[PDB]
Amino acid sequence: GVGISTGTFNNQTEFKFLENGWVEITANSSRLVHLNMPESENYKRVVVNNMDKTAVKGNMALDDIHVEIVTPWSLVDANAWGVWFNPGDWQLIVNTMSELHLVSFEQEIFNVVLKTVSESATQPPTKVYNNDLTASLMVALDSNNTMPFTPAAMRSETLGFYPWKPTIPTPWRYYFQWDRTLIPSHTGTSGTPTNVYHGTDPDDVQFYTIENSVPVHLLRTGDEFATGTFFFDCKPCRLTHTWQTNRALGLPPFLNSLPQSEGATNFGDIGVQQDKRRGVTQMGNTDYITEATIMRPAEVGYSAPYYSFEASTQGPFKTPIAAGDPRYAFGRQHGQKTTTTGETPERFTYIAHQDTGRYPEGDWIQNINFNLPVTNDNVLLPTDPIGGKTGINYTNIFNTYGPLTALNNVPPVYPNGQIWDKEFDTDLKPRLHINAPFVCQNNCPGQLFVKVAPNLTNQYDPDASANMSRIVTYSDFWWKGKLVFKAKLRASHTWNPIQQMSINVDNQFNYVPNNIGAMKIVYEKSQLAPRKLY
Amino acid sequence: GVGISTGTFNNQTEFKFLENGWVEITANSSRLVHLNMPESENYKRVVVNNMDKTAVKGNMALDDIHVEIVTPWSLVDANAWGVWFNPGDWQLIVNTMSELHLVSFEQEIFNVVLKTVSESATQPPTKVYNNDLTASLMVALDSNNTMPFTPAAMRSETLGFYPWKPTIPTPWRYYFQWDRTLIPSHTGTSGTPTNVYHGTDPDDVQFYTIENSVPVHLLRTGDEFATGTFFFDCKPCRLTHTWQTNRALGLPPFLNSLPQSEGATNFGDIGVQQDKRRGVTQMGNTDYITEATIMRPAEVGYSAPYYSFEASTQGPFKTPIAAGDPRYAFGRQHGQKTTTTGETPERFTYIAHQDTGRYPEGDWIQNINFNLPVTNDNVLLPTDPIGGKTGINYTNIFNTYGPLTALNNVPPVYPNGQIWDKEFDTDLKPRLHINAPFVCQNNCPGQLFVKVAPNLTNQYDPDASANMSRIVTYSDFWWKGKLVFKAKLRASHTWNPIQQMSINVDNQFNYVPNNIGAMKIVYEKSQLAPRKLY
Amino acid sequence: LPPFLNSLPQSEGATNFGDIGVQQDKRRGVTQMGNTDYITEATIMRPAE
Amino acid sequence: VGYSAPYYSFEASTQGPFKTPIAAGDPRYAFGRQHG
Amino acid sequence: IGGKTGINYTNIFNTYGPLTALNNVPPVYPNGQIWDKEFDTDLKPRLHINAPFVCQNNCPGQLFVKVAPNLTNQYDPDASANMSRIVTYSDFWWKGKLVF
Amino acid sequence: PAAMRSETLGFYPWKPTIPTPWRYYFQWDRTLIPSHTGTSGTPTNVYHGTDPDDVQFYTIENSVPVHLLRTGDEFATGTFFFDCKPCRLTHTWQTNRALG
Amino acid sequence: MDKTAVKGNMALDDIHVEIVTPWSLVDANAWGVWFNPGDWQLIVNTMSEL
């Protein structure tokens, strides 16, 4: 079946309007993947140590020591908005829909090709490329999710973001258990602190192998491989933002005095002594009913320790937060001006709100007796130092998460954000994930692994440390996916128009190529349109 | 039926999504109309003369002389976008739809009320208002369009634009035939030019009366009046704009030389001698194939005489144009800051494009022999004077309308634009109307006329020039309409996002009221989204 | 729709004209002359020609 | 039968000048080798 | 006109109107175009100067060809470089049928 | 249409031909003011740039399904039926001076 | 511009912008692609409308 294609190229996205403001978005995405022979046909357990870095009292956060099992397989990840939608599409989705539902997903590998490089060592010397018509491309689709979940979006290693630009899969590797101790220290810290990699705990050792836990298919040119259709089990993602804070929840105080002429200084006036007002308060002490005192239903948002690093058996790690900022570093293949030189990533900090965010500088604590103006001794301000440290206040320690905490889930981040994420297999689970807006609880699509089957030479001896020598082979194959969403059309509820993504005299050139054909994909806001929270 | 309401107030707009990217927009609009007794119960033929103004050699365009028949009836006009949609709605329609179809229209008059004012001439003196429970409000709906078509949008005299602000109908009046001569003159013109109103031509006299050609209903409080549903016969209005001009129609010339490094000065190069190129030209003379010479299918847009005033039996009038600018003057009730003082209208010049527009300064004409660089004697430029006038060039006279003229229809102008317009009853008709995007050819909704029936006093004598004296009466009544459109949802066809109406840190306050409750409705662009013309 | 006359005649007479009663540049209505604020019977916008 | 139009008239719009097209009676065809 | 020695009213002149009769473009063998797509404007040209046949609503779709990228063993998406590919080219037969 | 730049398929059955590189216009602003040999001072001639509102970057990959044909493969279009008026192969000669 | 910069060389204006695609177009829209001289004679000589 050499002279016959086994698939079709399709990179169109279709919006099929169903019944009652609900539409069905079908994002088709296909690409040409380039894959090289494994640098090593073996599984390696590799340790990464960098104490020297962390050895510098004050450089703890720069800790990279970990252990990973390097597999001879590559992973074809497409989990990132940039892989399915282009700027124009994102505008549409983001501007006219009000919520998105992730529905199904399927992939296929067609028109497989395997070539061979001959080093025609003549003069220059030359180099030749030929077709190995009988060579095979190994494919494995871990449907039962046996293998560790390794989303490539976290290291900006997904498939390209341009339909017309060949891409490639990423070398697959996963974490291996290890013990490590690193004790905090600042510039002044005396003597060498404790910084040591202890090793591996036998009881947590898990050496995974694809061969052993997943059936492998060998695809020759004539062959093709197709995944079935997976249907997710995720909650709907919203494309609306709330803005209210406890200070804007409920019936505003009745103004007994209203302005009588336009004017920035023409304010209205409640017109009632702060301690002779009616209403509800949760302060059994005072008779003071103020906008900061009046009782609200619950609390929109919470406060958490900032730049807090906790430690467990593998080392320190930043205490994650649900507030509002992700920082995305990437490049060339996923945005970053294509013609850009050097090897410095491009990046952005997607800022998302005032929906649950906090201004620490505005926080403060007072003595139960109240008694204002409050005395310095009865107030702990975000200015008074903790532990004697000049740069540490109670807020860095503070946590106001509790039974009344209201909160929203992560918004979509085009085009660098991950789309769906697998849930933790713990008995109690995170009320949300910080990395993706969609989390398949029970079932998530299985990972797809590719690998160029070993093209041996006439000389091969299993019983020899040597290192099998094989014909230089590589494979190019097309990949095609289909991600289906279900979305609801938004409606206008206010008299005033609203936030909409548009092209300006300023963005204009972030959506077109240049005289050299350089390109780039700029990030974009996703939940632009207020929604009444209460 | 005095103590019982006869209608419901509804000012909601509903979008009902049907099948296949088509939605049904139902704009409901109801309002409280205030109506006063006729200043005169009679029909008057009134002449308006202002020669003194036009008598000033050079002030011809300021000619207002006309004759009109003043009727004792008021007209309830709702034909203007501002009456049916608010800013938020217009954004939705304009941003997500790709074409609009005017479908049906119906009105109703309910909860009629008639009051009487008593001048309690005590001290101040006082004033009293009472209910005339047996008084009637006269209503007439000219279904057969017997009466002259007088759209109130042309003089900014529609119903209000705010649901919560009582409005009023406009005194109805229509043109009466008259003869008038006014001869052009400029400041220097010598002797008094000819400026005279000749009178009326018996053969064109048409004195229209509602009583005589329309059935009138008398509505007392308990009564209510409802129009049936009219279905228009109009072409679809587009919500997309084209941008191509003959210079951008077709296969661009093949560049034999392309840039090799980014750079504003790194241009591509056709790479072929202008007279040794292949292609098609409509210039049988030259061998010059240039972007301004190469042959295009037809012509996008045309050129017409500018600030041309033509004259017919009623006087001078500006020669109308289909190009791209309307100027809208209005106020208080239809936009203009509500609290604004004085009596100076608010206004704007809706600029709409580069779709068919022309830059006269760029036009020029040359001798058939061609022969360039062209000699002054073989070129008439938009600079060389015509008729000796320093400020007149051939372009002011010029007209390039013909068999190849491509062209689009008027876009919607929110909120001051008229919605539909009646077609001329001439054997040959305008390929379009400059005042509205929708033109019912055969059938247009009939005009609705209101009038407070005469509340006579005990003293009334028909046979006396006097002037019937009647009890001071006035009526308030609610009006409610329903305009239905059918629209298609737009799709993304380019890789780049597109123009979208949005709220900025700049418009923000054009969509909210002030501390005094002042309000205003700012105009907005309607066909924002390119469409491939060819 | 003819312009609304704010002043109407009060006695028969060939010279008893009505009067729009509004400054030519402070009137409301539609014009196709993006320059001026002059809305005159020769300036006001008409459907077609 | 027929009409008269401005000759060697170039009009201008947002992309530049362009010859005012005509319906009269002449097209000029430049080509080569592969098409004659 | 305008003082120009080489400009007369005719160069300005236009006598197109309600009584203008006129015919469409004739076929030009063998260099003329056959059919042309109509402008998507609300008002359209009474004719096209480039072809005698104009499909109003529907015109045949354009056919685009392109040699798929024949990569070499060395290819790196994340590099400004400029993908290097094996020099490839294609020959193929085309066959059409136009019916009048 | 490639006929406007004489870039169609060959005209001889027995002579291999080739397709043309596809390219299309992109919106741009440009001013050029008329002038004749005598015109004084440098006239206005400038390319202003691109208007964001008329930007349309088209991609085949993104808006058309692509087929990959290997030797053994073949591709066929269906039959399109035009909607055009008849073209005449007759000429009229009368002018107002010969009517009636 | 240099070309058009020559007062009197306006018609020789070529400035434009184009998007160069990596695709080629197979155009057959031209009489010469479908009929040869002999055929054109026949059509043109004996038919009255096409």
Rounded alpha-carbon distances, angstroms, from residue C28 to B59, B157, B360, B521 = 20, 9, 30, 16
DSSP string, A278-316: -S-BS-SS-----TTTB--SSEES----TT-EEEETTEE
Q: Which chains touch D (3 or more CB pairs under 8 A)?
A: B, E, F, G
Strands A405-406 and A299-300: parallel
Query: Which amino acid would we find at residue F12?
Result: Y
Location of structure tokens 């000048």:
D17
Domains, chain B, ordered by start: 1-534 (2.170.30.10)
Element (H, E) at A161: none
CA gap B220, A265 in Å, rounded? 49
> Scanning every residue of chain F, which has its alpha carbon at the shortest distance from the alpha carbon of G17?
F26
Shortest Cα distance from E69 to chain G (angstroms)? 11
Shortest Cα distance from B495 to chain A (angstroms)? 5
**Counting beta carbons within 10 angstroms of the beta carbon of residue D20, is it exposed (0 to 12), middle (13 to 18) or buried (19 or more)?**
buried
Identify whether A373 is preceded by a cis peptide bond (ω within 30 of 0): yes
DSSP letter (8 states) at residue C18: B
CA gap B278, C11 in Å, rounded? 79
Alpha helices in B210-340 (DSSP H): 210-213
Shortest Cα distance from A35 to chain G (angstroms)? 24
Q: Across the interface, do F80 and E58 touch by the CB < 8 Å criterion?
A: yes
DSSP string, B140-182: EEETT--S----GGGGT-SS-S-TTS-B--EEEEEE---EEEE
Rounded alpha-carbon distances, angstroms, from residue E54 to A33, E24, E39 = 43, 11, 10
Touch test G–C: 3 Cβ pairs or more under 8 Å: no
- Sort out which chain F residues have CB atoms less than 8 A from D1's CB and list them: 92, 94-96, 99
Q: Across the interface, do A9 and F68 touch by the CB < 8 Å criterion?
A: yes
| Backbone dihedral region for residue A382 (phi beyond 0: left; psi -120 to 50: alpha; all else: beta) | alpha
Strand partners, A300: A406
What does the block give as tokens for B251?
């296969």
CA gap A164, B298 in Å, rounded? 35
Q: Across the interface, do G14 and B290 touch by the CB < 8 Å criterion?
A: yes
Location of structure tokens 């976290």:
A154
Query: For residue C44, how many other CB atoms are within 10 A of its CB?
Result: 22
Location of structure tokens 């109801």:
B30
- Sort out which chain D residues have CB atoms less than 8 A from B360's CB and list them: 12
What does the block give as tokens for B204?
């064109």
Touch test E–G: 3 Cβ pairs or more under 8 Å: yes
Of F55, F61, F70, the CB nearest to A508: F55
Phi/psi for A486 (5° steps) reads: -130, 130
Count Cβ–Cβ pairs < 8 Å, chain B vs chain E: 109
Find, among G28, B181, B91, A439, the residue nearest to E65 by Cα. G28
> Scanning every residue of chain F, which has its alpha carbon at the shortest distance from the alpha carbon of A510?
F52
Please state the separation of Cα B421 from the chain's center in Å. Answer: 9
CA gap C19, C8 in Å, rounded? 6
CA gap A73, A75 in Å, rounded? 7
Shortest Cα distance from D3 to chain F (angstroms)? 11
Query: Which amino acid would we find at residue F88?
Result: R
Element (H, E) at E81: none
Find, among B533, B532, B531, B534, the residue nearest to B98 by Cα. B531
Contact F24, G12 (CB under 8 A): no
Contact G29, E34 (CB under 8 A): yes
Find, among A264, A144, A258, the residue nearest to A210 by Cα. A144
Rounded alpha-carbon distances, angstroms, from residue A254 to A251, A257, A270, A277, A283 = 8, 9, 6, 10, 21
Find, among B221, B196, B226, the residue nearest to B111 by Cα. B221
Test the A interface: residue of F68, F71, F73, F75 with most A CBs within 10 Å:
F68
How wide is the angle at C-alpha E53 spanned by C-alphas E51 and E57, nearest 5°? 120
DSSP string, B62-116: T---EEEEEEEEEE----SHHHH--HHHHHHHHHHEEEEEEEEEEEEEEEEEEEE
Chain E residues whose C-beta sits inside 8 Å of any chain F C-beta: 23-24, 26-27, 30-33, 35-36, 50-61, 63-65, 68, 91-92, 94
DSSP letter (8 states) at residue E19: T
DSSP string, A239-285: S-B----GGGSS-PPP-SB--SS--TT---B--S-TTS--S-BS-SS
Contact A123, A439 (CB under 8 A): no
Contact B410, B432 (CB under 8 A): yes
Helices then strands, each counted (H, E), chain C: 0, 1
CA gap A511, A190 in Å, rounded? 54
- In the three-class reduction of DSSP (H, G, I as helix; E, B as strand; rest coil), residue F91 is classed as coil
Element (H, E) at B51: helix B51-54
Residue A96 makes CB contacts below 8 A (sequence gap 6+) with: A489, A490, B95, B96, B489
DSSP letter (8 states) at residue B361: G
| Experimental determination approach used | X-ray
Strand partners, A450: A74, A139
> Scanning every residue of chain C, which has its alpha carbon at the shortest distance from the alpha carbon of B348?
C34
CA gap B226, B303 in Å, rounded? 47
- HEC sequence for chain D: CCCCCCCCEEEEECCEEEECCCCCCCCEEECCCCCC
Element (H, E) at G44: helix G37-46
Chain F residues whose C-beta sits inside 8 Å of any chain A C-beta: 26, 50, 52-53, 55, 57, 59, 61-73
CA gap A83, A165 in Å, rounded? 12
Q: Across the interface, do F32 and D12 touch by the CB < 8 Å criterion?
A: yes
Q: Which chains touch B (3 or more CB pairs under 8 A)?
A: A, C, D, E, F, G
Shortest Cα distance from C13 to chain B (angstroms)? 10
Contact A487, A97 (CB under 8 A): yes
What does the block give as tokens for A37?
């022979």
CA gap B129, G35 in Å, rounded? 90
- In the three-class reduction of DSSP (H, G, I as helix; E, B as strand; rest coil), residue B378 is classed as helix
Query: For residue B338, how many other CB atoms are within 10 A of its CB?
Result: 18
- HEC sequence for A178-229: CEEEECCCCCCCCCCCCEEEEECCHHHCCCCCHHHHCCCEEECCCCCEECCC
